[PDB]
Write a protein that binds this ligand. Structure first.
Ligand SMILES: *[C@@H]1O[C@H](CO)[C@@H](O)[C@H](O)[C@H]1NC(C)=O
Ligand SMILES: *[C@@H]1O[C@H](CO)[C@@H](O)[C@H](O)[C@H]1NC(C)=O
Lengths: 107, 98, 577, 94, 79, 94, 108, 97, 79
DNA sequence: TCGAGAATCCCGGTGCCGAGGCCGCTCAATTGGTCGTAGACAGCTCTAGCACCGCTTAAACGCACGTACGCGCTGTCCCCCGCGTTTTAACCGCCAAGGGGATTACTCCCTAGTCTCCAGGCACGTGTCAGATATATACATCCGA
DNA sequence: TCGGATGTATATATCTGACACGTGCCTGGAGACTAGGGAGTAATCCCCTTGGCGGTTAAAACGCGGGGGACAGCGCGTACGTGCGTTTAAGCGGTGCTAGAGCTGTCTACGACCAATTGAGCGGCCTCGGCACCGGGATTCTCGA
């Protein structure tokens, strides 16, 4: 037969198209799953992951640390209005809290 | 000797604790409390250490959010000292006791 | 100006109510950072030999362009997601926001020592000094011509010299509509009340329009070759005829204006000529803004950079300065790296056009006869649509065609675009690369290792340190280009920061933004959001096969090319009134 | 042991594409895996609801696009939508 | 077993300081302990029921994560 | 038109069982139908997710009972569970 | 064959067993649905509906009205602690609000 | 001249409106506002009358809950009158800002 | 300027139903802003739902669908 | 402004455990056909939403007022903070028993699927009776006196 | 404290249209099978949980001193609730028009499904360097003159 070519290579994405399609089909979401839905879902997931990873890397570089730790992840997520709105009710383990103090409490 | 005026080292502690990511509640007392609480639902229950750690993180996050809202209520009430009625009002507004 | 106006002025006057001078033409550039001149009043670095920049000697722009950007032209790597249309639209957009005037050689024949021929270092001449071992010119006595930028406020050496902006700061499609009232008056015909723009009365392309001819004392178009006798085209910018691709884009815009005016006259015969012209100008400006902020910016900054620097439009804000930043002039010229050594021309089958389908860029600059007498703008547009752009690589910054043999036919010797850009940056006296990194908030490298880490290439860091010595001595253009690309973008983080900030300032400060309430009818924006570049090329150009949405990305045939009928036409039924 | 499936390799590939030198930790890997699983679950649930919701038995690209537009707030959604469309377009090409 | 005193007064003080509280009264600790007990009771009940269905005698971290997700306080970093 | 199935006569039968005299208006009919649909959807979704957690692809009485115990708060849940058990028993004997 | 008896009659339930089973099977909840799950669901739904409707009828009788209007249903839902917890984030159309005033706002 | 002291018929109105179940927002202005807001997203939009009614009911419920929480905040602040700061604080605590 | 259609007596009546005795003069502007924000969110969700179904009429069924999505599910208007 | 002082921040060596990379291989993704059907599309219809149009009239608007209240200022004391000291057990590092999570094989019983048919549930059409709408009455309740 | 003023729950007619009922019809729920695989149940492996030991020392508890702010008077400007006179579109009720929501009939191409193939990713096993810890010096904010 023809040489194997992963669906991620065809779509140009890095996330697994086949795994997403299998999860959608076997996730009890719909009786049938279209051939274009998993590619779109993988693209959206990859874009969101790239956004969060880039913000976390920026925060880590600002903190003079090479490796990304959950504190950097929380600093990146909570400092972005859109991402904060998305993860409104999500607690990140060992994430800490944004450094802030009320104006009146200051001397 | 050197005696810092009241309200000074409190701000330093606030700045230090808002910069770190450690766990503020001691591990063993929290684990024992979790075991005692679960004792009322099923006898002879074994807890994974990861489960206790996740419970501790969730409790710490919830308590921190509640304290933030209570501090907001207190600063709204023209006060800088948090009082239990502020905690009750914050819980009522958030929708837990309502 | 009266408080009840709904069309932009030609000069952009009173665009901001608080300050009428904001964004107006013939005004000084706004400075984000304080000037970094040589003596602190008015002098470029390198003017006086022996003076060091922050303790390190300054490097010649030609010297730093010889061994940093220059790379063999046989190892070109085409960009698989960038079309030549992308670079062409970038250049056209740059031809709208800024144009730094220079004193004329004829007017400076007495004290300006005709810098175009001689290179004695007297004002307003700032010649590029030459290093040894130069591949092109082995003689050290030679000199690349260069003209000092015109000052803003002439007088004593009390204030730092600025630069004058000769174009409207706002994005109002001024590249083909002009920027001054005398320029706009003769740019539109008054023979009738149709409201159309000027159309050439000598040569036509298959019954379609072209830019009107112009007459100058020393026309560079006539110097291409004397067997042509085709003059330079006249449009909203003097350099509209610099390249045939740019003038074909201007031809497309002029044809769009003419077609829109004709369609509006057909829809509303009772409207007068001036009202029709103003409506067409407003719609074309909204078109240009929509295309730039929907199809071009997402393909430049990247999803992260645009989302961080270009948030969702809330409302018009009059507190943001809409003037062109002095660093934007030297930062948006990154498109020189995306240029290609050859210009391509294709048929309706998208195949090479005889006799010269792949013409070197050396024999194409200031060639207005190619558009007029070699098939028109159809093959030029086809080549721009179906030719991949050159990928911006650290060791492949710019091709040698624009680096060694640019403007060869016009001037006595060929110029060098990268060294020209760096010399312009030094003339404007903008701070170093490190200072702009500090301004954008990014980390500021100080040693060789830190520069290699931030640029992700130790070899290029060593190459840069061999010339500049310190990161603070790096010019803005080289530092911006040499930075690693973003994700799904084409510029470095510093260039992304600068471009995003400037475009956010231009959009927020625009009182005539297409999304701003009042400027456009609340129902017309839905019809205007359906416009797209390939559809309008289909409408105003004889070709029948174009690219899909986001034309700047599709660069293959016939993998992602569709017919004209598929694209939805622009609906003007809401303009009946 | 069994084969448990996680998104570690894909998130690491994305990080390497974005930051060629920055590394990641095990806790951050677990956090990203949980986040991607949660976002995928939310989008798939919204799409399943929408598919069943107009009496349709299939999930197409339109359902996923509408779910992304509904869930993701603000400019993010638009960008994501564009990205999604682009991906589908490539499958149309090849 | 009166083990609710395991969360000491300095622990609640540290939590408040993390939350951004400058002055803490003396009657807050009882209320904080009660609130923590209520929240732990709810989450533990949900997790214990989840474990009860699966015929297991060990409450894994996955059950606690699922209970928190159901309660509207989805927790990342454990699966 | 077309058949639009809804819990209309069942709520009335329950009312007749409980209150042999009082009726119920159309707006309260719609409110009761919406409440029944919402509770059914919540319990079914909880049961589906809970069965998905244990890698079991079949929803049985145990999953529904556990979902009811998790979802309904306080004494109600216990009563509901008891009622459910009785119903299942009446199937087994008959 | 034999006389056809609805599955709701065998379980002694007034709610439809078959309709609940069909909805569970075709709602894409699980690949396979057991036999006892629809009956358990019908019993739970019947008990919940009976409780809320009994409370609504009590409120209506307290209001000297025969028919049950949405106001009575809202009063029954909100006046019961467990049902209030169950429907905490549920808005009933034309339901109103329970009559209450804070102690301090009372005139004195 | 029988003039009620400030704060009596206000409580009478409170009792009357809590005892009733009508709609306190005029139907036509709310419908016009809904149409104006919706037309910013898609022109030539047609709304069913039931759609306006449902939107009005949801809006009234949300506004009543917000006003109750704002009154609670004001009473906590040792005040009877509600102020915009109380509304902002209630919205911030609820999780909408 | 149509948001003024929410008359000041209407907001006063809503607050009276909510249980408010005295209302400041600056409350009305904030109430109008909050109402506009909430209506914008709900109407955007409903319009997206309607656009998905290739329909030009936004029904009440899609409105209650959007309200249920937002976490403010409403009864008496369908499901 | 101007010194002491204590906490915090900025650099130089240490090494260690977690992160990145490599190696088998196995189970999941791919390719190549098949076929049934869910959705796209064309046409028709007839709800039902949209656009004036006139008449009431409850409601909104605008204004005079004065009184309860928001807010500012001030005095008390006592509750909480800072800190020094002593007592408590949290924590760290092995160390062992084993309950139970986790995995695997047989099978058997239950649920998917199909054919049939008959009865429950729906939409129709309706007549009456809770209920909304006037109307006078007697309390329910508030404001100087 | 008691007589007058306003508001309203209450008892009494009087229509009224919403609904509970009766009925014809339709479609899907149920009876009666067949068939295959989900998982129930033994049976086994060894992972990680619990209980225990003992030493260090970080942390909690307790008490003393003091200061600042929570709270209660006290008063002053003001603004907004209350009522009256004026103005206004909301609502109602009809009327007409046509947009398109919804339904039905055809047809196709798109995804579920099955079989053979093979390689992408996961578990195990490494090897090394980023940083937590350790220490010492420079910086800075606080506080008493
Ligand atoms: C000179 O220009 C004319 C323009 O018509 C062109 O035809 C001709 O080929 C050119 N000659 C050369 C030598 O380039
Ligand atoms: C305009 O932008 C400035 C910052 O350039 C910001 O401070 C200001 O608030 C903005 N104005 C508005 C009306 O948003």
């Amino acid at each position: 037969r023809a040489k194997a070519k992963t669906r991620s290579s065809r779509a140009g994405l890095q996330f697994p198209v086949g795994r997403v399609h299998r999860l959608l089909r076997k996730g009890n979401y719909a009786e049938r799953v279209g051939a274009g839905a998993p590619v779109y879902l993988a693209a959206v997931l990859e874009y969101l992951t790239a956004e969060i990873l880039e913000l976390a890397g920026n925060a880590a570089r600002d903190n003079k640390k090479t490796r990304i730790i959950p504190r950097h992840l929380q600093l990146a997520v909570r400092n972005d209005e859109e991402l904060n709105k998305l993860l409104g009710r999500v607690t990140i383990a060992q994430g800490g809290v944004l450094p802030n103090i009320q104006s009146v409490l200051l001397p | 000797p050197h005696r810092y005026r009241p309200g000074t080292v409190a701000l330093r502690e606030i700045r230090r604790y808002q910069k770190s990511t450690e766990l503020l509640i001691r591990k063993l007392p929290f684990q024992r409390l979790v075991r005692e609480i679960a004792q009322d639902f099923k006898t002879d229950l074994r807890f994974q250490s990861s489960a206790v750690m996740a419970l501790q993180e969730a409790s710490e996050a919830y308590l921190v959010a509640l304290f933030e809202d209570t501090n907001l209520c207190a600063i709204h009430a023209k006060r800088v000292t948090i009082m239990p009625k502020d905690i009750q009002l914050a819980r009522r507004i958030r929708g837990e006791r309502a | 100006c009266p408080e009840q106006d709904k069309y932009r002025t030609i000069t952009g006057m009173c665009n901001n109510r608080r300050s009428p001078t904001l964004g107006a033409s013939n005004r000084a550039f706004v400075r984000w950072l304080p000037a970094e001149y040589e003596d602190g009043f008015s002098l470029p670095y390198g003017w006086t030999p022996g003076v060091k920049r922050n303790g390190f000697p300054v490097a010649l722009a030609r010297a730093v362009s010889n061994e940093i950007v220059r790379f063999p032209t046989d190892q070109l790597t085409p960009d698989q997601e960038r079309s030549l249309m992308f670079m062409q639209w970038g250049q056209l957009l740059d031809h709208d926001l800024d144009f730094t005037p220079e004193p004329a050689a004829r007017a400076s024949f007495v004290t300006g020592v005709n810098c175009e021929t001689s290179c004695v270092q007297q004002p307003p001449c700032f010649p590029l000094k030459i290093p040894p071992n130069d591949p092109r010119i082995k003689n050290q006595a030679d000199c690349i011509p260069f003209f000092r930028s015109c000052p803003a406020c002439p007088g004593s050496n009390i204030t730092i010299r600025n630069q004058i902006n000769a174009l409207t700061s706002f994005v109002d499609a001024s590249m083909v509509y002009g920027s001054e009232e005398p320029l706009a008056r003769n740019l539109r015909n008054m023979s009738n009340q149709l409201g159309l723009l000027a159309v050439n009365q000598r040569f036509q392309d298959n019954g379609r329009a072209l830019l009107p001819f112009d007459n100058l004392h020393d026309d560079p178009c006539l110097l291409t070759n004397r067997s042509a006798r085709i003059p330079c085209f006249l449009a909203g910018d003097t350099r509209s005829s610099e390249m045939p691709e740019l003038t074909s884009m201007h031809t497309l815009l002029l044809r769009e204006h003419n077609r829109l005016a004709t369609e509006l006259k057909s829809l509303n015969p009772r409207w007068d000529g001036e009202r029709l012209y103003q409506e067409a100008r407003k719609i074309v400006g909204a078109m240009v803004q929509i295309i730039t902020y929907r199809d071009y910016l997402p393909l430049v900054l990247g999803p992260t950079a645009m989302r961080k620097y270009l948030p969702t439009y809330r409302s018009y804000n009059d507190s943001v300065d809409p003037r062109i930043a002095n660093v934007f002039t030297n930062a948006f010229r990154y498109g020189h790296t995306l240029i290609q050594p050859f210009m391509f021309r294709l048929d309706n089958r998208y195949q090479p056009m005889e006799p010269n389908p792949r013409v070197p860029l050396s024999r194409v600059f200031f060639a207005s006869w190619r558009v007029v007498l070699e098939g028109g703008i159809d093959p030029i547009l086809r080549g721009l649509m179906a030719t991949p752009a050159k990928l911006n690589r650290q060791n492949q910054i710019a091709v040698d065609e624009i680096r060694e043999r640019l403007f060869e036919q016009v001037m006595r010797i060929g110029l060098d675009l990268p060294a020209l850009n760096m010399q312009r940056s030094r003339d404007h006296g903008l701070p170093g690369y490190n200072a702009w990194r500090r301004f954008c908030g990014l980390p500021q490298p100080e040693t060789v290792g830190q520069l290699g880490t931030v640029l992700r290439n130790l070899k290029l860091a060593r190459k840069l340190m061999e010339q500049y010595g310190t990161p603070n001595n790096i010019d803005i253009w080289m530092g911006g280009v040499s930075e690693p690309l973003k994700r799904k973008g084409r510029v470095g983080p510093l260039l992304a920061c600068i471009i995003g900030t400037q475009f956010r300032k231009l959009r927020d400060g625009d009182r005539f933004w297409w999304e701003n309430e009042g400027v456009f009818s609340m129902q017309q924006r839905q019809a205007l959001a359906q416009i797209s570049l390939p559809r309008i090329i289909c409408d105003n150009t004889g070709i029948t096969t174009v690219s899909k949405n986001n034309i700047f990305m599709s660069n293959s045939y016939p993998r992602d090319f569709v017919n004209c009928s598929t694209l939805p036409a622009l609906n003007l039924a809401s303009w009946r009134e | 042991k069994t084969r448990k499936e996680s998104y570690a390799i894909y998130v690491y590939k994305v990080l390497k594409q974005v930051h060629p030198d920055t590394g990641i930790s095990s806790k951050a890997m677990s956090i990203m895996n949980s986040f991607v699983n949660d976002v995928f679950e939310r989008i798939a649930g919204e799409a399943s609801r929408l598919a069943h919701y107009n009496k349709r038995s299939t999930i197409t690209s339109r359902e996923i696009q509408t779910a992304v537009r509904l869930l993701l707030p603000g400019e993010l959604a638009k960008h994501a939508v564009s990205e999604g469309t682009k991906a589908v377009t490539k499958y149309t090409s090849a | 077993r009166d083990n609710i005193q395991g969360i000491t007064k300095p622990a609640i003080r540290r939590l408040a300081r993390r939350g951004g509280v400058k002055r803490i009264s003396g009657l807050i600790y009882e209320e904080t302990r009660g609130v923590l007990k209520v929240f732990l009771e709810n989450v533990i009940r949900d997790a214990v029921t989840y474990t009860e269905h699966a015929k297991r005698k060990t409450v894994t971290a996955m059950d606690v994560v699922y209970a928190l997700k159901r309660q509207g306080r989805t927790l990342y970093g454990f699966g």
